[PDB]
């Protein structure tokens, strides 16, 4: 599977982004995808999940509420809705999947190594007004 990234840009504190990640083959109901973000100088590191066959979602700390993860309904994809956006928030996102191991917790699948399988990244600037 190859993983398919929209833009990002410059936003301004307090908007909202929704961000796409669109899978080559179809969704398996083993694959979870996942966001990741590389902070300015610091490792990529776990925004949240979404189990496909479920739709169980799993998220950081740090996003929790504001960052919410859904299947596409008409799409072989996510959406990743980033909201009341603060210039901490300004990173590279990554979309990444996997295909959970039986007896894994999808949930569990928040580290890199996780993922086999990687987006290109979407740039994220977010400034004050
Ligand atoms: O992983 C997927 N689909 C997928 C769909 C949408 C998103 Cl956002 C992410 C992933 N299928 C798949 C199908 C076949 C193979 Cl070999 C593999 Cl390795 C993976
Ligand atoms: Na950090």
């Known amino acids: 599977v190859k993983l398919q990234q929209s833009g990002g840009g410059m936003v301004q504190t307090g908007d909202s982004l929704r961000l796409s990640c669109v899978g080559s083959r179809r969704a398996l109901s083993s694959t979870i995808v996942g966001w990741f973000r590389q902070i300015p100088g610091k490792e990529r590191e776990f925004v949240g999940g979404?189990?496909?066959?479920?739709?169980?979602?799993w998220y950081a700390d740090s996003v929790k509420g504001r960052f919410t993860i859904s299947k596409d309904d008409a799409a072989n994809g996510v959406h990743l809705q980033m909201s009341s956006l603060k210039p901490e928030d300004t990173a590279v996102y990554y979309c990444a999947s996997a295909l959970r191991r039986p007896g894994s917790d999808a949930s569990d699948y928040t580290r890199i190594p996780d993922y086999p399988y990687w987006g290109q990244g979407t740039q994220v600037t977010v400034s004050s007004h």
């Open positions: 979404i189990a496909w066959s479920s739709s169980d979602t």
